A paper describes a structure:
To explore the molecular mechanism of DNA replication by [name], we tried to incubate the dsDNA substrate with the hexameric complex form. To our surprise, the addition of the exogenous dsDNA leads to the increase of a latter peak on gel filtration and it still contains the bands of F8/[name]/E4 on SDS–polyacrylamide gel electrophoresis (SDS-PAGE), which might represent another state of the holoenzyme. We then collected the latter peak fractions and prepared the cryo-EM sample. When supplied with an exogenous dsDNA, the hexameric form of the holoenzyme changed into a trimeric form, notably exposing the DNA binding site of the thumb domain. Middle and right: Map comparison of the trimeric and hexameric form complex shows that [name] undergoes marked conformational change during oligomer state shift. The trimeric structure of the F8/[name]/E4 complex might exhibit as a more active state due to the loss of the interface between the thumb domain of F8 and [name]′, thus releasing the dsDNA binding site of F8. Once the dsDNA substrate or another factor binds to the holoenzyme, it can trigger a conformational change into a trimeric complex, releasing the DNA binding site of the thumb domain. However, we could not get the DNA substrate-bound structure when using both peak fractions.
Author numbering:
A (entry chain A): 1 to 535, 545 to 893, 931 to 939, 957 to 998
B (entry chain B): 3 to 218
C (entry chain C): 3 to 44, 102 to 282, 313 to 390, 404 to 425
Write the structure that this text describes.
Amino acid sequence: MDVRCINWFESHGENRFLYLKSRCRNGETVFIRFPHYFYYVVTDEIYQSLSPPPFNARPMGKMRTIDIDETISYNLDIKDRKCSVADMWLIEEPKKRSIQNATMDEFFNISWFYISNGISPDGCYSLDEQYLTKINNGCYHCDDPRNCFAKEIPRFDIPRSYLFLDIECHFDKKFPSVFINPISHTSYCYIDLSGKRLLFTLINEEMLTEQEIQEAVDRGCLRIQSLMEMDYERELVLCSEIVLLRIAKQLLELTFDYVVTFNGHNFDLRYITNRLELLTGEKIIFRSPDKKEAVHLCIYERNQSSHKGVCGMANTTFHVNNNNGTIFFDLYSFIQKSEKLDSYKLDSISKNAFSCMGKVLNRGVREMTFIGDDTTDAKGKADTFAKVLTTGNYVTVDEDIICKVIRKDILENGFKVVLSCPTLPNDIYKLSFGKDDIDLAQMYKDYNLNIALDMARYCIHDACLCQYLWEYYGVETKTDAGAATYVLPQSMVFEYRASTIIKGPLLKLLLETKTILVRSETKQKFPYEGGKVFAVLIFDYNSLYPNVCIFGNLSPETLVGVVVSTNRLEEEINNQLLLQKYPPPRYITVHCEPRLPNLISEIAIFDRSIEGTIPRLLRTFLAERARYKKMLKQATSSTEKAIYDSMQYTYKIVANSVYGLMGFRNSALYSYASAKSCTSIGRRMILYLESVLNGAELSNGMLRFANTLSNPFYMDDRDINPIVKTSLPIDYRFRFRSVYGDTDSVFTEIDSQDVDKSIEIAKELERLINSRVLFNNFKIEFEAVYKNLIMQSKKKYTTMKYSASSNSKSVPERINKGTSETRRDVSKFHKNMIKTYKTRLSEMLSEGRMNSNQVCIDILRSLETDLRSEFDSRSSPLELFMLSAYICPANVPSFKLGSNQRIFYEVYFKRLTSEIVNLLDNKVLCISFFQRMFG
Amino acid sequence: SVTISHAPYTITYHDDWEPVMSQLVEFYNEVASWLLRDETSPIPDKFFIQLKQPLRNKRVCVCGIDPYPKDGTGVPFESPNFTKKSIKEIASSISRLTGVIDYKGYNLNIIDGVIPWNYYLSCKLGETKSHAIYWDKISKLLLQHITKHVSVLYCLGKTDFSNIRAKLESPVTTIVGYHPAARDHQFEKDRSFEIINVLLELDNKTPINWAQGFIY
Amino acid sequence: SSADLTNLKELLSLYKSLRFSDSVAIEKYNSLVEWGTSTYWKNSFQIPDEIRSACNKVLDSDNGIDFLRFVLLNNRWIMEDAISKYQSPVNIFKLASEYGLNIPNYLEIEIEEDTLFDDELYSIMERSFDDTFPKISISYIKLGELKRQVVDFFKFSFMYIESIKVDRIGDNIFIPSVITKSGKKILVKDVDHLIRSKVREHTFVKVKKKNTFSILYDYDGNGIAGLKQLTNKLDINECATVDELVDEINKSGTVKRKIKNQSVFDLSRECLGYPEADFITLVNNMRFKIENCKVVNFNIEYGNFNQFVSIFNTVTDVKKRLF
């Protein structure tokens, strides 16, 4: 009996159970019920002295228990770790037990249920039906998940139900209330198992005159006054609010696989439940698959901060309390969690997710036709944009141009769309989807039939946006990847932090290496630098910190000791005894930063003879992500191209999350030394590269690297010679000036300032600066920031100006990646002139020869004459500001102005010229111009 | 005594409730129509009788969650015949600090310093937690105003009170508790009592005399 | 739970008496402040155990007291008063005497009308206290209140110090007493101004001097060795040979346990006359160059440092030879 697992959930009642929702080969759904236990790892002597005897105990072999408490030491006589080796056992307790000196207590019982039984949460199995007794139609009982989930077959494909919904409510306040305002429309995107994608919008009768209701029934709609009277094949339906809410309740109680919605946990589902209770006095009944437990829909919060101060804000996320297996998903919470966008409205999210390009076909009065094809613009973007156009109404051209469509044509490939926008000169225009300029508040004060139907369209498009976005973010495959990398149920994948996802891989590891890390001592905190700020080519490190915790073999259990020295003349004695004792390269002594004064040494000693748990974890993660990148490079199907992409991304996310998890106090990977160590090794490596990257190159085969290629942390006899021999054309002159970098970049100042001469030389340097200057597993990569991409501040303060791999006949673009100046709630008058002031700001940084005089006189004259011309002419319109109102006196040297034109810009006008000083090399003209700008 | 639209058509309060009482009127007016759609307990005539009690001379709030569905009285945990469930239990479990056992009644409304507070000011008679939807806003508001004049909070509830810090826009000493509505009353393992006393010292308030409330 | 009541009562108790608390006491103070906020959202030397029992008994003789004010001066645990809310001083003093503790005596002329302490009421008081102990104390007790407002007499002036050395405080123990300019050895009370404080000889330093005794005066604005001084600094014998030293250390049973648990920078700065305070502040000011765990070169970038290196190499060598 073959099944594929969709979701794992537990019953929250008197009886603890664990359910498996799975789809068979032929599309039938079967649930399986496992007794849920508590799991305790207990040594042999404890097990033998147990009273009463445990319910079930299975051996675990000889595990070594390692005490990983870090004890500082003021002399070089460090006692070795306390490491026992005992025969362990696994105790399975139906009801919780208080058992003393039991270890491995940081791992959930669901992780144990998976690992001990050898079950992947997303695998596809051939269940030995000899054990699954039947309790009711569609539910089996499995007492022995060991011998029933034995034979594991390869992954096959199954059908999956869905429901993407959205509602709209009457209002005159900012947000409606369940008591005063009734819901107007209610749209759905019901995707059955068979594949039937049915869209339909229910409209509220009771806001219409009977005359317009009859007009609508004449026009095209259906009318229902009962529940059994509706059918989802009709695209528009008119009904009261009681039948509307009863249909909503009838849908939400179905066993869909997912029920997706954007911020539909806080607003939509809550509004529906509350209003249904008010109107009809009914509730939404989620029944358990064994029909032996029914709950009512009730939304509950879950604060997410792993550290909460006083008077702060934690991202409270609302969840449904359903217990039937359906994964009530909310795209809003997922998007806020996974990606750090600029804003999180559905409109802007769409406008940045569904994009394409459109070439003008035939202009006209108040109209314009755009074509978008695969062979012309980026492959796949035209197809997704044509998938969004089937329901959308208001298409957005490159900027601030929102146009109501007139006619849309979905070709076999591409799209042709007519827009009601005034004439535009340029032939190409980038089309993004969605801002929908409508006065809903005003549209509700004159509600009639045409407006009812307009809003029904507005609502069905918003209900289908939650499907286009659900497919864009590949959530259905990221879920099944996370539910297998992190050994967790498909429902608990995005609900938790790193400290919770990391425990499945870690527990699977500790049963190979047979270690058990314990801590019989409390931990102390020492605050640190949580974020770096700083200010040509761009080479980055291949996941620097996993590579460092693998190079240095950093771990809590492979720490020999932290030899510290109070003051001078003891650090020296200790340094000499650390040069003789603990010698390279089996031990590595890293000079961490002093944890408390008075101390000047804090040297940490790591033994590099056995692979710790953390470095072995990281190596497995890197190896699997590499395997999946390879398997994706060779993927032929369009489904495998998604499965393997999701798996690779999952391994990336779980690998990058370990370094932050070592400095996190209440974590299963905590070690103050290793955290403070890999931060110092990485910094030393970065500074080493910066040291040897300031070297000139001439008479090809020099690239002197500016210094001897001396390996840090020890000598290694690696042909230490600055002058190397490259393989590029002979006559060259370029020097690379100072490089700064943060941790995942080292920008070197190339003295060429042109493409086609950097891409080649940099691609041949990166091969020569990661095979001749780096040592063990510190690889590098390469990109290029074309013509001084504005480096205002730390990482997320730049423009895009992309030049990745090709520079011959290549197409760059320079819109933005700032995520720093795009947000409203600010002025609208004087700024947005950057859209006109950038063409002269991007051009004052792209000359190199006349650049100095041009930029200085340009900033000076431009800003002084902008001040005077705004004070005299009153020219700039009121459009936007675009920076992340205010009033200020103008008498001395809804957003509407005053009588003196120097009201509120005298601060932004100097903050702007303050932001843009770190892109030149002038130290006298720039700062003096700044000082004189005040008068 | 502000005059609301629906029952009881007016709410007489104490002089220390005006920092809130104004918006309570609209909060109650938008929900009253459905609120009095069913006869609740307490009756609509004693919804806000606890709004008569001053908050200056009080420093501890033993916050229940919902009144006794079988005819609560508008003052939490009170008993006109001392024959209820949780009140006799807490009187018993508190009969050990004072060391006395003789009581004809024990209301927290006469312990000078403590104020019994019902989170949800009403419930459908016979049902529990059945008027939460009608009360959420006013309940959060009344609690936030009760905590800005006193400083201690003893939520008599195990899981009913789980996110109390979220529904409070200001830091106040939020002690928690375990609902003795369960079996064994669960009050023996945890000595919740006298923790209020210890915590009333770090700002020099007087300890609660839990004997002040018996009937003699 | 009751377990929580334990640390809560401890928090309250220690919060009541921060003034007399220890380092681990203020540690528990802040740790319990945090353990409370994260659940509810808002010295002297060692006193013997045969003395600890009597002190625990005397703390109960009158429970109005919070701590035991033991004056730790010149390796003497001499108390001047027991701060007990109701207990008289003479009763606690008689109890301590029955236990074997150092209680002082009072000799003064009392007046039925309180007169303001002045030149006479401090000089004659110091001269009439008749106590043969080293202290500038002028002591009194008033009936009706337990507050302590002590008086004393001296005058601040300048003098040029003699050296950085010691005066024999006890048996084979020379505790540092920098001799005054006239010749007297000053009476240093607390280890703050007693280790090597202002070791500077011939320096014009301002101190609060009197006719016989005195005290050190800190600034207001801007702010001699050998094997001999090692053998008596841990009290085994007098010596001038390393073999003698190590052999006498072997002959001991507890002195070896004392050396085993001390560092060599400590032991070499403690038996030299300036353990930590400004020493390290200078040893960090100097670049160093050593070999085989023996300093051989130094460069500034106090006075007993050359000889300090000379005895430091010696203690390192004897520790190596013994261990």
